[PDB]
RNA sequence: AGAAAAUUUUCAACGGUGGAUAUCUAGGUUCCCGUGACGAUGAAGAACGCAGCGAAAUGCGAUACGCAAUGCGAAUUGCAGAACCGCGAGUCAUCAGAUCUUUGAACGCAAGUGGUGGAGGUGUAAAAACCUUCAUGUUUGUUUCAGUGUGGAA
RNA sequence: UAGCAAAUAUUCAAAUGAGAACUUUGAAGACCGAAGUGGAGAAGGGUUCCAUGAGAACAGCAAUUGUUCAUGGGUUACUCGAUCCUAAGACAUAGGUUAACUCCUUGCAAUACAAGAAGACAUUCGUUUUCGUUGUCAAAAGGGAAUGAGGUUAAUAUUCCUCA
RNA sequence: CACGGGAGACCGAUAGCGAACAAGUACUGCGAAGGAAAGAUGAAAAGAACUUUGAAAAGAGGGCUAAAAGACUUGAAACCGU
RNA sequence: CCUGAAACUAAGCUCCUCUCAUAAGUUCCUUGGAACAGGACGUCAAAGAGGGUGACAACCCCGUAGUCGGAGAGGAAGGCUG
RNA sequence: CUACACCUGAAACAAGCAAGAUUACCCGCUGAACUUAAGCAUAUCAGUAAGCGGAGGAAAAGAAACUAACUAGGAUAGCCCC
């Protein structure tokens, strides 16, 4: 009977975390059956504890799975939308910096041969 | 409608409630303009605030007797100055291509203005290289560091 | 400034909308088969029934389709004296008899 | 009689619950909801027409699952793929 | 009557649950002004909307 | 400073409110038509009236 | 059927029949009859339901 | 002097009804300044759920008044039980990673119905049951095609 | 104070309770009189159903009683109905109209039309074959595959149990 | 208009946004739409121990507290009792 | 008379976000249930804006000021200058 | 006639795009009456409300087929004047 520490969880394997999940769930059901028949406050607390626990376990499992899929897709564009940047529809729909600044030839020429200079007037 | 007083002139006849303008921003606005101007100076530091403006006569018979700041220099004038529009622009000079000189004197004023400008000019090229047109002035001018207003220098 | 009944009869959403639930079929002729323009097609009166909006009886006529195995049913207008199970002849060469269908010429 | 004895005859109900707005605004005979207009597929409300409405149904009226955090992460620059980091610099 | 949608059943269930009285121990909290549940409803005096 | 002006109007103007008309042995002031709220029939926007 | 299977896999019993209720309260009651093989009272006893 | 009471009535004190006045305010109102930043990567809104003891309001979504990360570094507290002194408390804040039921622009079809198609997965002796998937428009392409459209070698 | 006067009626003893014309048992007298004051449904209601308990309020007198308050518990189906079918009807799609929103057509199916279904091998595709113009919603009295008797609960039962 | 900042010769619970509060809520309407009322015990619950009479509510004693201020600050008028 | 995509190569700044820290009486009397009151002696002040602490508290606590200051973390729909 | 090329149309598939929300400000349309003329048609209210379609952080506008005739001025937008 102890609190569950996240890092400790990230230490284990996927198998491990899963087995534990199943165990936890079975625990819960037993416990609710506690509430129903007859039960001690110990069992009541047990409930909330195990619930939160299960959540935590799941959380970890997804962290891992995720970092894995992201790994496979690392390097490619055409990742699954899950992973693609989500900011604003308007954000993604917009032009690039490349395209923002991108300049027609004549322009690059004027920019070279005329441009702007540092000057000072004296008085 | 009673007395001898002058026939009123209706004002609020329509629904003006939607159409009123309020001036409280003015307070802060002035201030904003200040800081803008100042932040321009700082970002422009070696260069002057207002770009070079030629001068002309005003457009009305009553205004002719007076002097007014033009928007740009006449190509004819840049020619007599010996500057290309493009260059003058890289210098901080203001050019206007639709304006035309119908008088010798109007050429004169602006020539005098341009020349005055150039004479008082300092030009920073890519570091320690020197150049030719409108020319380029010595590296020591970098130390001279002039923050100046155009009315002082070219009046 | 009301709308007379006179006017209300042209409304199609209206109250005046025919009661069609009883109608059996339109009563029309055969399709204009080649057979009818150049020859004769014969059919039977399977029955002559009463359409609920009609004064005139309708004749239910079996025809054999020229181009397929299907048997074609059609509803004609009863010509007085036509019997159930009569042979009705339609076309160019069909002869003159009560209830046959020819060109007027 | 248009009155009390008449009221006894009302067991019909012209509206049912609109899937979209969930009141009983749905008109089975007209196939629409008087409030939102569920089949219409864009929200039915006339704003200038009469003024109270948006404050009854409208944006911010019910909880906004997505948008509330948009205010906050608007300022944070819309971070994606970032994790918070310790100021203690543990490696 | 007898015949019901799911939707109906669920809605009715909802309102049935929501119709409980304030639990006697909530009145003992430090930050609450609530003596009673102001939103309780009686089928006879007030009717729901289900159609 | 000023009093609320909004889409609805100057504050206090926020009802659709009528004048019952002379027949009712009541004052002619605007009231709030409606049903079910104690505010119903209550005098509508004007200096005289609460709210 | 989902209930029959799940109940067997979970409780190691043979379910002879399953019947379903939707309470107004919003839950599903399942009345489950075990085959002659098992004894409800027993499953009750192991589960902590006595 | 029907010179007592009861009634009717003036004034005061106390009591009762009632909530004015005075003093307050995590509210309103107006002004100035800063950002505009929703949505098929499924929005705004809707339904039903989620606490050991919970109706509402607020939060949340079967990981359900919350997971993770980060910063604060010991509480929550109405009751009961645990967890934690740093393997770190917390109805704390921050918030950049997750969870995100039935819906809704709402999408296989349909709908006052958890009804019902095709393809794939699963299951079985075969089924049932469960699961995933399929809306329309458009810009490119890819593949397969039609045209007594224009040409047309061997 | 007006008032609590329609719909023939109540009475006795016991018990319970602080308290009984108004609650429960029994004993009498009457009523609805199978066109019911009886037994069950549809619409509508939504927990008003069952049990235990009960201070105030409410049940226009009263109450030991309740349609009220509190707590717990109740709604099991291959054969009942929805779900399927078509109707009066209605709406998409396609095409057209509108500044636009909107609007017009569609079962005798189109103001549309290069829109389908099936089989087999293959068993995916593909291959192959055959026949082919093109949607959906609307009935808890219409159409409509098959169940009955007996027993059981405080509250469900052509559903659970037993038997067929 | 939304989320933020700051401010005011504004308003101060019949005022001020309709909403200082489980307020666009309760409630009404077939519906489009309508839409309120409702803020202040005390510094601290110390929220009235115990005795007595009551079937019970409650009364009389007795007590907390600076004070009952006891469903609550002040506590006006109309009206009512002594 | 001017210019410079490629490649190679040095040093830097701007803006944004989240965190962490800072003066000086709790001395003495009197009235108070409470001292934040009236007195006596003291202090800081580029801080006597404003709040909270049992009462009209600069000095008890949060703050205010030095602070376009200092320290730590992460940022740029992938900032800017040789 | 075939292969094949090109023009035209079609189906399935891959990758992307639109569909709703927002209200203060902005754009394009549509568009009245109350009211004022002490009556009332023109007119006024007024291109105003309501209605519809589109956006953005702003929108729109903008480098003259502009003014002015003077010793001329010179994109657009806002302020002041006129
Ligand atoms: Mg501005
Ligand atoms: Mg029609
Ligand atoms: Mg709300
Ligand atoms: Mg909200
Ligand atoms: Mg019903
Ligand atoms: Mg009723
Ligand atoms: Mg009613
Ligand atoms: Mg009178
Ligand atoms: Mg008094
Ligand atoms: Mg933690
Ligand atoms: Mg498509
Ligand atoms: Mg060809
Ligand atoms: Mg009477
Ligand atoms: Mg009776
Ligand atoms: Mg009966
Ligand atoms: Mg009965
Ligand atoms: Mg039909
Ligand atoms: Mg039709
Ligand atoms: Mg049958
Ligand atoms: Mg059976
Ligand atoms: Mg006493
Ligand atoms: Mg006193
Ligand atoms: Mg008196
Ligand atoms: Mg003392
Ligand atoms: Mg002192
Ligand atoms: Mg102070
Ligand atoms: Mg500081
Ligand atoms: Mg092609
Ligand atoms: Mg739109
Ligand atoms: Mg007017
Ligand atoms: Mg007049
Ligand atoms: Mg005009
Ligand atoms: Mg935007
Ligand atoms: Zn709706």
UniProtKB/Swiss-Prot annotation, chain A:
Lineage: Eukaryota, Sar, Alveolata, Ciliophora, Intramacronucleata
Organism annotation: Tetrahymena thermophila (strain SB210)
The keyword Aminoacyl-tRNA synthetase belongs to this UniProt entry's keyword annotation: no
Gene Ontology CC: cytosolic large ribosomal subunit
One example of a Gene Ontology biological process annotation: maturation of LSU-rRNA from tricistronic rRNA transcript (SSU-rRNA, 5.8S rRNA, LSU-rRNA)
Listed InterPro entries: Ribosomal_uL29, Ribosomal_uL29_euk, Ribosomal_uL29_sf
Residue pairs linked by disulfide bridges in the UniProt entry: none
Gene3D superfamilies, sorted: 1.10.287.310, 6.10.250.3450
Keywords annotated in UniProt: Ribonucleoprotein, Ribosomal protein
Name recorded for this polypeptide: Large ribosomal subunit protein uL29
UniProtKB/Swiss-Prot annotation, chain C:
Localization (cell): Cytoplasm
Family of this protein: Belongs to the universal ribosomal protein uL2 family.
Protein name: Large ribosomal subunit protein uL2
Species assigned in the record: Tetrahymena thermophila (strain SB210)
Residues of the full protein shown: 2 to 106 of 264
Swiss-Prot record, chain D:
Localization (cell): Cytoplasm
Entry keyword set: Cytoplasm, Metal-binding, Ribonucleoprotein, Ribosomal protein, RNA-binding, rRNA-binding, Zinc, Zinc-finger
Cofactor note: Binds 1 zinc ion per subunit.
Lineage: superkingdom: Eukaryota
Gene Ontology biological process terms, A to Z: translation
Cofactors named for this entry: Zn(2+)
Residues annotated to bind Zn(2+): 18, 21, 33, 36
Record's keyword annotation contains Cell cycle: no
Cited PROSITE patterns: RIBOSOMAL_L37E (PS01077)
GO molecular function: rRNA binding; structural constituent of ribosome; zinc ion binding
Database matches in Pfam families: Ribosomal_L37e
InterPro entries: Ribosomal_eL37, Ribosomal_eL37/eL43, Ribosomal_eL37_CS, Ribosomal_zn-bd
PANTHER family in alphabetical order: 60S RIBOSOMAL PROTEIN L37, RIBOSOMAL PROTEIN L37
Protein name as annotated: Large ribosomal subunit protein eL37
Organism expressing this protein natively: Tetrahymena thermophila (strain SB210)
Swiss-Prot record, chain G:
Sequence intervals crossing the membrane: none
Similarity-based family: Belongs to the universal ribosomal protein uL23 family.
Entry protein name: Large ribosomal subunit protein uL23
Organism expressing this protein natively: Tetrahymena thermophila (strain SB210)
Full protein: residues contained: 101 to 150 of 150
